[model samples]
Target: QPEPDMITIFIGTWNMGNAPPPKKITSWFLSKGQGKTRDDSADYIPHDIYVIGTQEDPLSEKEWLEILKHSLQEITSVTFKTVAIHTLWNIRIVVLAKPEHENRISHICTDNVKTGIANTLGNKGAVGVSFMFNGTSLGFVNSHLTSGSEKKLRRNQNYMNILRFLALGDKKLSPFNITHRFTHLFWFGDLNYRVDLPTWEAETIIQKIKQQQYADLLSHDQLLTERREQKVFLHFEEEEITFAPTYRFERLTRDKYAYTKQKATGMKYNLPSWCDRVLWKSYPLVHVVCQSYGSTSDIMTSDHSPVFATFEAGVTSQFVSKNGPGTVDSQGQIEFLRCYATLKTKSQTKFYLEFHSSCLESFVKSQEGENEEGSEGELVVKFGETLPKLKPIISDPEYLLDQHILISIKSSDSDESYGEGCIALRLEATETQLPIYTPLTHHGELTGHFQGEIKLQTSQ
Candidate 1:
């Protein structure tokens, strides 16, 4: 029943500079090759996913969300669902997936890190989201790095901070680091990297660009230079930029770059640069084929033009032995149940875990040690230093299996130890050998951190 095929993804980014929302977005979302008007026989197909990133957007989160939803519906005549939306200061990133594939997405989470003033402000930062689509994990980051032509080092530092500090939900989440968390990742926004050349030389390059000689201009782009030197985005890949520069355009006269004289100092103005960009990386299991990469010059509302990319992703199916336990014949594949947990504490701390009953047999079997060839096994759960090892006390197996398991830990001679740590589950076999066991090596694989304050109540 799984829909296995190539999926089309459309990604777009713009620095709106607090500009008013567009009256229509059909042209922006529609493919160039497709007919100008949407007729019944139009060849263009609606994308499976739409990712839009914006910087300096004037509208509130709710207003923008509603606008995007209405725009997509108006264009395609089909309703789309917003999978996730993350905003950091003025930077916002939104992901929309077609309604039919909604159920396939799971483990949804998001996080952000500020790299602006004092390394705590949101003016310059990155907001990211990670989730599993079907069985493949995906990540999307919308960032606004340090500005100015000479701040290359600061931009690199910002990139590093985003990679190391961004986290979803809690610390115990699998694939903890954002850089290594997803099967595929797309990074897009106004990076603010400038052209590495003197104003006169940059103007000369612009003349050459008009003459269809872009290679030389791109060769001197700051981002390309830094990337070649391995100073930033070392492994990420970007499609060839055949379009004109995407920044510093005159407001109403969109055809000309904004050229002005610097105040008091009486110096020439800054040169145009491709400040907006889109890049991506993929793991071995996912194949990404870029179909188009360019800028939409007609939308003249902002000083920066919108950049968009179209990608077709092919996700390979994961293999599991047919005889493996928990392998369902309907999908004809092995489906693993992922557990989720939340912790609450006061005088007593409680850790609650939720999962499906059908996963119990395989979950326990996989946890069985290799030495336990034929014996009953029990699972041991441990949290921080304050809690003792606890076991699942299953009563009314039928009824209990249908709901969550709550493990309560009462504080004994405890001090104030309030922090975060992982909740680990280990299996212990009653006998040294157990046969026909599937050893649950992947249990608790998807669970996040157990964090809360444990305050002991004293008698009054």
Candidate 2:
């Protein structure tokens, strides 16, 4: 069999509380906040696709991206407003990739509440993001539906609304003739529903999705299990694995929060309650391969621990010539050597970093020209003085240079003047993880970007 050309992707939802400014946000500590809090210093895997849960302050989003740029090169965002009052924020989806794959971002499309539903439903939780690469495409819908509202009708209505919004296929349910614009659709998030023995409420949802031709990644199987053990069900394909749970809360701490003990505590004993999951249109993912899967336990990243699955894409190789051979004449070699010498002697290898900083500054300045002084012009990059200490594992430097790091810049107030930055560095080394530092200024203080790192190597 041919080696699968699979692109790995991890899809997990994390509730980062407060929505504080970049500098004010709490740092990630294992004992304290596992998934909820993130320190500026920890390095997150460069994700080809990422989505943020809750809190939609545009400015906070920009600040957070600036802090994340040091680790990622390709960042794409999907932001939208929901209809719920006091639910004033939007959701964001970010995508990162390698340089070669950078140009492969063929198309980007979004399904917002306004467009997905009728005026009757208002906006509620109706938003989805789509990306097209080569012949393959993926669409993502992130939402946390109302879970057992005080009024059962309201809860049912919320679920039904999401169902009609996604499964109905556009404004008209054209029956068999309806054409879906998106080829591969993944509906995931804190669904707040479960399918276990004898629960007709959960059964109704299963029937509804099946009617819409959608498959759940956790519960699509014949073998029965307790409500606590069901993790993900696939409606589109045969079952390969069984019994996985995505949510858990400590019973001991239930008394601390009124909502916890009353609602989430009892749900822990059952291993897989089939709450949070990935619902897909087809089985056996084609473009990417699933690598790792897990759910949070005693460690609480959010009220609900995070459940994640990693995927990988296909691969290819490129040729390289080392410094040993003189591929060109002495004149060419002399010119190349001169440039190399200059790079080595430079006090600060600020060409790439500085160039990006200048680009952002210029982009912002141009916006300022068109608007008032206080108006947002371009997105900004806040740098830090000292870089963070990176993991000590030895890696190829060239690989890091080729990997794309996505940066998002949005106005502090609105989403209209948003800017995205993509950074890719080339190195003589073969690794894909490069180390760099960024200085960020917040509240009159200049601290190192938490995830920034240093490296002792030259680029190719």
Candidate 3:
């Protein structure tokens, strides 16, 4: 089979300082200076995926999601849907993807860790989510590290804390750690590492930034220096930053820096620095290309500017199977290899049915039918005196390997009335809740279902 094309992803991070997002949030998604003229077509094509992170977000998770959904639709004609949203204290992270490719994405999970005050406070921590896209697993983490220029060591410790404690689903089932599990991992947000030089010396270096000498100043960046010494984020790759410092900006001003005086008889000011960042790491068989990375100055709602990055991720074709074994048919149906059941009655004339299926990749569940008097096609199953319905115990759309399910069916009138009666059962394999049936060939078809009847008997 031909290799699948690489997909573009856009990532953004902002520290809002407990402020609500602006009404023109959509504009931030567009490329800077590309949409200045009304007649000018947008220079950026809509990305296949969007991962947005915010620190100190004031809105509730539900409210932020609604705002994001409405703003995304208003910005572009493409139809996008939210895949997952996670929060750790004031940090909020949301992921969105194109609706057409929903089936290709699954195994969604999230985890978080608090690294503040005995590692119990949510004030400083990381929230992360991982998912499988077209057979490649990807993980995204949004973190708010320790503050203060002298606390670089604390920030590094926080990174270690997140890696050790963060997990998705049952640790025994999905046991791989965050850094090693996914094909590609993205880490971003307010990592408060600062420049190493003193205030007067840092200001002298800032003057040369306009002369294209910013590289000299970047060499002294605490994060970069630690990275060079093989400390934190040992293998992560960051795109070259040609933009100016993103932190300590004056409110309502684009270019001026915010200054805070020290509490001494004589006064000294804090030096401006770049505290926000985006970085990524690619494991084996994954290729990541960074297209752009910079900070947006137009958003002045906070003292820090927002940082954004674009990447194109490529995965090996062999990672996803074409059609291995029992896969979905052309009509998008998964045919069970076989389905059977044994029915019996107890001392109270209670009916019990034990259901079984040969297919291990999928699960069987009774569909919700109208509950009305004289309902014609309801599955007659009961657990006690009442009819019981069978639904997936696990909510994840992927990873259902349980082969047996037990359901009970009882007659509304009386348990004795169900004696010697044929009980009909109907089960469906849904794409949203069961393992997807992927055929070996794009046009192949496989048949599978559970529509059968078993007669119930009274006690011997």
The model with the greatest TM-score is: 1
57: Cα error in model 1, Å: 0.7
Compared with the true structure, the alpha-carbon lDDT of candidate 1 equals: 0.59
Global CA lDDT computed for model 3: 0.59
Model 2 / residue 390 / CA error / Å:
56
CA error at residue 319 for candidate 1, angstroms: 7.8
Per-model clash counts, in order, read 17, 59, 10
Q: Is candidate 2 or candidate 3 better by TM-score?
A: 3
| Candidate 1: tens digits of C-alpha lDDT, residues 141-192 | 8888887777888888888788767775324333234544455788889998
Instruction: Kindly provide the TM-score of model 2 when superposed on the true structure, using C-alpha atoms.
Output: 0.40
RMSD of each: 13.5, 21.9, 18.0
Q: Which ten contiguous residues of candidate 1 have the minimum total lDDT?
A: 435-444
TM-score of 3: 0.64
What tens-digit string does per-residue lDDT give for candidate 3 at 1-460?
3445588777888888677766666655653521111112644367778898888889998988887777667777676888899998898789999886677778898888899675436499888888877656678999999877778899988888887677852243221346545567899999888877776675575576546466777888888998888668865799877777777777666667664555631254545677888899665335588876777757787878778787889643222123323453222222322122122222223233222222223323232222222134323232222222223223222312211222222233342212111111122334322221111100001111122322221111
What TM-score, over all chains together, does every model reach? 0.66, 0.40, 0.64
| Candidate order, TM-score descending | 1, 3, 2
